[PDB]
Write a protein that holds these residues in place. Structure first.
Motif, PDB file in Angstrom:
ATOM      1  N   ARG A 131       0.897  -1.152   0.002  1.00 30.15           N
ATOM      2  CA  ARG A 131      -0.197   0.149  -0.069  1.00 30.15           C
ATOM      3  C   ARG A 131       0.798   1.172   0.148  1.00 30.15           C
ATOM      4  NH1 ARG A 131      -4.857   0.252   2.194  1.00 30.15           N
ATOM      5  NH2 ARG A 131      -5.720  -1.243   1.164  1.00 30.15           N
ATOM      6  N   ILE A 132       0.504   2.212  -0.893  1.00 29.78           N
ATOM      7  CA  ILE A 132       1.210   3.386  -1.270  1.00 29.78           C
ATOM      8  C   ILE A 132       0.313   4.660  -0.812  1.00 29.78           C
ATOM      9  CG2 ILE A 132       2.008   4.644  -3.173  1.00 29.78           C
ATOM     10  CD1 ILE A 132       4.188   2.998  -2.079  1.00 29.78           C
ATOM     11  N   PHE A 133       0.803   5.618  -0.484  1.00 28.87           N
ATOM     12  CA  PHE A 133       0.122   7.062  -0.242  1.00 28.87           C
ATOM     13  C   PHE A 133       1.099   8.172  -0.401  1.00 28.87           C
ATOM     14  CE2 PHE A 133      -3.631   9.239   1.362  1.00 28.87           C
ATOM     15  CZ  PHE A 133      -3.070  10.657   1.644  1.00 28.87           C
ATOM     16  N   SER A 134       0.583   9.069  -1.090  1.00 24.11           N
ATOM     17  CA  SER A 134       1.323  10.223  -1.232  1.00 24.11           C
ATOM     18  C   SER A 134       0.399  11.412  -1.661  1.00 24.11           C
ATOM     19  CB  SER A 134       2.492  10.194  -2.284  1.00 24.11           C
ATOM     20  OG  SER A 134       3.548  11.245  -2.063  1.00 24.11           O
ATOM     21  N   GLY A 135       0.776  12.682  -1.290  1.00 22.42           N
ATOM     22  CA  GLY A 135      -0.162  13.799  -1.642  1.00 22.42           C
ATOM     23  C   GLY A 135       0.680  14.911  -1.945  1.00 22.42           C
ATOM     24  N   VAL A 136      -0.106  15.753  -2.932  1.00 24.65           N
ATOM     25  CA  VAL A 136       0.484  17.212  -3.236  1.00 24.65           C
ATOM     26  C   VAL A 136      -0.685  18.405  -2.990  1.00 24.65           C
ATOM     27  CG1 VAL A 136       1.241  18.483  -5.113  1.00 24.65           C
ATOM     28  CG2 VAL A 136       1.972  16.285  -4.753  1.00 24.65           C
ATOM     29  N   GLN A 137       0.030  19.391  -2.486  1.00 24.62           N
ATOM     30  CA  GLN A 137      -1.017  20.366  -2.080  1.00 24.62           C
ATOM     31  C   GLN A 137      -1.518  21.428  -3.397  1.00 24.62           C
ATOM     32  OE1 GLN A 137      -0.169  22.802   1.744  1.00 24.62           O
ATOM     33  NE2 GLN A 137       1.715  22.413   0.587  1.00 24.62           N
ATOM     34  N   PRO A 138      -2.770  21.529  -3.491  1.00 25.46           N
ATOM     35  CA  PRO A 138      -3.211  22.500  -4.596  1.00 25.46           C
ATOM     36  C   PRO A 138      -2.922  23.995  -4.314  1.00 25.46           C
ATOM     37  CG  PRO A 138      -4.950  21.754  -3.194  1.00 25.46           C
ATOM     38  CD  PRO A 138      -3.899  21.222  -2.567  1.00 25.46           C
ATOM     39  N   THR A 139      -1.685  24.180  -4.214  1.00 31.46           N
ATOM     40  CA  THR A 139      -1.417  25.713  -3.775  1.00 31.46           C
ATOM     41  C   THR A 139      -0.960  26.637  -4.820  1.00 31.46           C
ATOM     42  OG1 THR A 139       0.716  24.799  -3.129  1.00 31.46           O
ATOM     43  CG2 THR A 139      -0.768  24.927  -1.378  1.00 31.46           C
ATOM     44  N   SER A 140      -1.096  25.983  -6.030  1.00 31.64           N
ATOM     45  CA  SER A 140      -0.765  26.658  -7.339  1.00 31.64           C
ATOM     46  C   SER A 140      -1.429  26.049  -8.594  1.00 31.64           C
ATOM     47  CB  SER A 140       0.861  26.860  -7.388  1.00 31.64           C
ATOM     48  OG  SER A 140       1.302  25.428  -8.014  1.00 31.64           O
ATOM     49  N   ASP A 141      -1.299  26.996  -9.558  1.00 31.79           N
ATOM     50  CA  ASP A 141      -2.048  26.591 -10.859  1.00 31.79           C
ATOM     51  C   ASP A 141      -1.109  25.471 -11.689  1.00 31.79           C
ATOM     52  OD1 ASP A 141      -4.608  27.919 -11.189  1.00 31.79           O
ATOM     53  OD2 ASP A 141      -3.161  29.552 -10.695  1.00 31.79           O
ATOM     54  N   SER A 142       0.222  25.014 -11.072  1.00 27.78           N
ATOM     55  CA  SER A 142       0.901  24.311 -11.831  1.00 27.78           C
ATOM     56  C   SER A 142       1.889  23.544 -11.046  1.00 27.78           C
ATOM     57  CB  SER A 142       1.569  24.924 -12.980  1.00 27.78           C
ATOM     58  OG  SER A 142       2.600  23.720 -13.529  1.00 27.78           O
ATOM     59  N   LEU A 143       1.823  22.191 -10.931  1.00 26.44           N
ATOM     60  CA  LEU A 143       3.232  21.354 -10.550  1.00 26.44           C
ATOM     61  C   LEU A 143       4.510  21.872 -10.986  1.00 26.44           C
ATOM     62  CD1 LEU A 143       1.847  17.800  -9.817  1.00 26.44           C
ATOM     63  CD2 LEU A 143       1.523  19.888  -8.382  1.00 26.44           C
ATOM     64  N   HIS A 144       5.355  22.012 -10.295  1.00 28.57           N
ATOM     65  CA  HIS A 144       6.706  22.488 -10.890  1.00 28.57           C
ATOM     66  C   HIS A 144       7.347  20.940 -11.307  1.00 28.57           C
ATOM     67  CE1 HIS A 144       8.461  21.927  -6.947  1.00 28.57           C
ATOM     68  NE2 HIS A 144       7.902  22.995  -6.669  1.00 28.57           N
ATOM     69  N   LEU A 145       9.104  21.094 -11.564  1.00 31.79           N
ATOM     70  CA  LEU A 145       9.454  19.983 -11.951  1.00 31.79           C
ATOM     71  C   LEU A 145       9.758  18.970 -10.654  1.00 31.79           C
ATOM     72  CD1 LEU A 145      12.144  20.725 -14.918  1.00 31.79           C
ATOM     73  CD2 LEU A 145       9.907  19.188 -14.779  1.00 31.79           C
ATOM     74  N   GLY A 146      10.099  19.765  -9.485  1.00 36.36           N
ATOM     75  CA  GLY A 146      10.312  19.008  -8.259  1.00 36.36           C
ATOM     76  C   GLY A 146       9.222  18.153  -8.033  1.00 36.36           C
ATOM     77  N   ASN A 147       7.906  18.601  -8.102  1.00 41.02           N
ATOM     78  CA  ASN A 147       6.818  17.714  -7.753  1.00 41.02           C
ATOM     79  C   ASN A 147       6.698  16.634  -8.700  1.00 41.02           C
ATOM     80  OD1 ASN A 147       5.203  20.744  -7.792  1.00 41.02           O
ATOM     81  ND2 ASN A 147       5.758  19.700  -5.722  1.00 41.02           N
ATOM     82  N   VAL A 166      -4.180  17.136  -1.545  1.00 35.90           N
ATOM     83  CA  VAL A 166      -4.487  17.515  -0.104  1.00 35.90           C
ATOM     84  C   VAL A 166      -4.666  18.902   0.151  1.00 35.90           C
ATOM     85  CG1 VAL A 166      -2.941  15.661   0.700  1.00 35.90           C
ATOM     86  CG2 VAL A 166      -1.767  17.585   0.247  1.00 35.90           C
ATOM     87  N   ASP A 167      -6.299  19.213  -0.217  1.00 30.38           N
ATOM     88  CA  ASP A 167      -6.659  20.532  -0.229  1.00 30.38           C
ATOM     89  C   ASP A 167      -6.735  21.057   1.584  1.00 30.38           C
ATOM     90  OD1 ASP A 167      -8.568  18.749   0.580  1.00 30.38           O
ATOM     91  OD2 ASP A 167     -10.167  19.993  -0.659  1.00 30.38           O
ATOM     92  N   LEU A 168      -6.801  20.239   2.279  1.00 32.14           N
ATOM     93  CA  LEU A 168      -6.818  20.633   3.747  1.00 32.14           C
ATOM     94  C   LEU A 168      -5.437  21.485   4.183  1.00 32.14           C
ATOM     95  CD1 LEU A 168      -8.476  17.757   5.767  1.00 32.14           C
ATOM     96  CD2 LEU A 168      -9.634  19.628   4.804  1.00 32.14           C
ATOM     97  N   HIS A 169      -4.336  20.932   3.790  1.00 32.67           N
ATOM     98  CA  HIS A 169      -2.989  21.339   3.973  1.00 32.67           C
ATOM     99  C   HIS A 169      -2.989  22.743   3.309  1.00 32.67           C
ATOM    100  CE1 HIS A 169      -1.106  18.028   5.912  1.00 32.67           C
ATOM    101  NE2 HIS A 169      -2.045  17.217   5.253  1.00 32.67           N
ATOM    102  N   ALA A 170      -3.697  22.998   2.092  1.00 30.92           N
ATOM    103  CA  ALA A 170      -3.431  24.170   1.451  1.00 30.92           C
ATOM    104  C   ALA A 170      -3.795  25.245   2.315  1.00 30.92           C
ATOM    105  CB  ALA A 170      -4.226  24.176   0.108  1.00 30.92           C
TER     106      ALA A 170
END
Ligand SMILES: Nc1ncnc2c1ncn2[C@@H]1O[C@H](COP(=O)(O)OP(=O)(O)OP(=O)(O)O)[C@@H](O)[C@H]1O
Ligand SMILES: Nc1ncnc2c1ncn2[C@@H]1O[C@H](COP(=O)(O)OP(=O)(O)OP(=O)(O)O)[C@@H](O)[C@H]1O
Ligand SMILES: CNC1=NC(=O)[C@H]([C@H](C)c2c[nH]c3cccc(F)c23)O1
Ligand SMILES: CNC1=NC(=O)[C@H]([C@H](C)c2c[nH]c3cccc(F)c23)O1
Ligand SMILES: [Mg+2]
Ligand SMILES: [Mg+2]
Lengths: 319, 319
Positions: free
Chosen positions: B5-21, B43-47
């Motif tokens: 089982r795998i889990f990971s999340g990104v924050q919707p804090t910008s209009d684009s992921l960058h290369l890092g993400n 993970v919008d709660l984190h935003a």
């Protein structure tokens, strides 16, 4: 109906409410539930800020609800429910913490849960569009944060959260310990010696009332300032009886403190017995208490989930 | 299936992921989703730890999910869902904060939400019995807290929480800024000048690659230590191509840094176009993306609510 909305909660942190809880809070609830749409909550999520025994926590959740009924909470007039059963509390708590200053929570008079529980308390109240919060004195600063974060949130999203009014009594705002009239009667004072528990052996409580610390003035006068122990006993006796303090204090002209502790222990004993009988039945026949709590939780989810989606919508969350 | 089982999340804090993400995280997800039961979360709660515009937050929640698909996340192989739609996260977050030292969260490198979000991150992972967490380097200390609180909780209630392993790459563990190779490429750096956004104008990103800060050594050698900007460009070029760095560095014997920035901008442009085309379609035809997210959330609630009731049961809550 659904207006004059009331919310208040007690922690299932012990096997018995004490007089503080019952006179400082639950008594107000009982008076209010007649013409107030009331939500009364056993707040078990708050309990685990401090480590809790799992068997006791489940037992005490029911015992606390049952003491609500045995003090006169009417499940036909009010909703009793268990906090952990309504997810909205934690949802709203996360949102509200994002609007709570760090210093703001620091200044509240160590785990993360110990640091954030006033935010969870804020969500407890605001999740039900609460107009009025009947609490004792010690919950005041807590509910001033609850109002600040509600106004803080409403300035960005007007009309979303009801800002609650804090409804705290006078006489009963703080029932003090019997050996230590400078402290409030609370469940973590080291001695149950100054602790009058609703469900203790009535002769044990009566024996603690007889051993209550008084002064030397030989005069039965209500002054919480200089006569702490003595004003407490009258505060207590007045609350369990319905008799105003002045009508007691004048009735106590010529009397000494023995007559005062006797009458107060007389009245507390006659107060707690009808309670202990009701509580016993509810524990031996849990069907009723669990039906109440089950209907309670569904009604609480119906209200609190609608608040969460309104808040979520205002934040910009995808629903 | 339901293991690895795998889990990971990104924050919707910008209009684009960058290369890092995309190279530091989503690339790992894409490789892993084939034989790992994967949960990928916006993970919008984190935003909202930081104030967010409601119209943008909802827009960016979808745009972030869509970038998950446009990078190769397969909704038939993995679950994509929005954090706020699964109540379990906040429920588990409250519990876990009661088991998180205050100093423990202090030492994480101001609101209450800014102070507690590592606990919410901990609940995000542990809510799904997660065995492995593919994150970049900057999320490591965070996930060491997640494991400590999971072990802290399991010692009182053995066998309740899965302790997750932290799976962080090497090359791509930190894609640095292009003007500032000492900092990591992140969405709050003041300049998008060093920021390569997936969804920016490919000729704009190519022009930032050409302006990348290099050294003077005139030698194309991979040493992140002394050759920061230059090792970054190769790190980047290797990741968007599938070609090992050594095979590039030897291919760059005799070459100068112009050829290095040209080829890297060549490859990033050919990387981001298939993405931007996919992302455009998903935004103009949202039916698909919302079906994915709707099935995603129901599957996430099915798993995460069972974890919450197991935790609640172990604590002693009345269910
Ligand atoms: N000594 C007291 N006098 C009057 N009201 C009290 C007193 N102690 C608590 N209350 C009221 O009880 C309600 C719930 O409080 P709580 O469950 O924390 O009881 P507590 O005695 O403070 O228990 P603990 O010591 O476990 O915190 C609040 O409305 C609070 O004002
Ligand atoms: N420069 C980077 N290099 C590699 N991975 C990164 C980088 N920045 C973020 N990540 C990864 O992205 C994932 C989610 O991070 P997040 O959504 O916070 O992106 P971010 O760039 O840090 O955005 P913000 O600046 O808004 O925090 C994590 O796995 C994290 O390790
Ligand atoms: C450690 N948690 C904690 N200590 C307190 O004193 C408060 C209190 C029990 C409370 C929680 N939710 C409420 C809603 C309405 C009124 C309340 F008095 C409460 O919580
Ligand atoms: C301000 N909130 C915040 N900043 C971070 O860096 C983390 C991160 C975005 C995250 C949240 N939940 C996760 C689950 C798994 C892996 C993760 F990287 C996360 O949260
Ligand atoms: Mg208390
Ligand atoms: Mg970040």
């Amino acid at each position: 109906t659904g207006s004059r909305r009331i919310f208040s909660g007690v922690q299932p942190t012990s096997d018995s409410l004490h007089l503080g809880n019952a006179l400082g809070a639950v008594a107000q609830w009982v008076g209010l539930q007649d013409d107030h749409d009331a939500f009364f909550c056993v707040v078990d999520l708050h309990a685990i800020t401090i480590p809790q025994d799992p068997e006791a926590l489940r037992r005490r959740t029911l015992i606390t609800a049952a003491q609500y009924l045995a003090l006169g909470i009417d499940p036909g007039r009010a909703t009793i429910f268990v906090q952990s059963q309504v997810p909205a509390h934690t949802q709203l708590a996360w949102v509200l913490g994002c609007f709570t200053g760090f210093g703001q929570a620091s200044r509240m008079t160590t785990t993360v849960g110990l640091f954030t529980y006033p935010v969870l308390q804020a969500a407890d109240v605001l999740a039900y569009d609460t107009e009025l919060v009947p609490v004792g004195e010690d919950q005041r600063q807590h509910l001033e944060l609850a109002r600040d974060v509600a106004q803080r949130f409403n300035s960005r999203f007007p009309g979303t959260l009801v800002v609650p009014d804090v409804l705290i009594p006078k006489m009963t705002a703080k029932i003090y310990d019997l050996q230590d009239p400078t402290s409030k009667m609370s469940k973590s004072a080291g001695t149950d010696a100054g602790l009058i528990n609703l469900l203790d052996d009535p002769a044990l409580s009566a024996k603690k009332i007889r051993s209550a610390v008084t002064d030397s003035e030989r005069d039965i006068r209500y002054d919480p300032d200089v006569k702490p122990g003595v004003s407490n006993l009258l505060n207590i006796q007045s609350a369990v009886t319905g008799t105003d303090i002045d009508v007691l204090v004048d009735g106590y002209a010529g009397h000494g403190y023995g007559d005062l502790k006797k009458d107060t222990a007389e009245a507390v004993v006659e107060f707690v017995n009808p309670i202990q009988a009701r509580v016993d039945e509810l524990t031996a026949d849990p069907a009723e208490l669990e039906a109440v709590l089950a209907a309670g939780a569904q009604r609480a989810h119906d209200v609190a989930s609608k608040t969460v989606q309104r808040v979520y919508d205002r934040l910009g969350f995808l629903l």
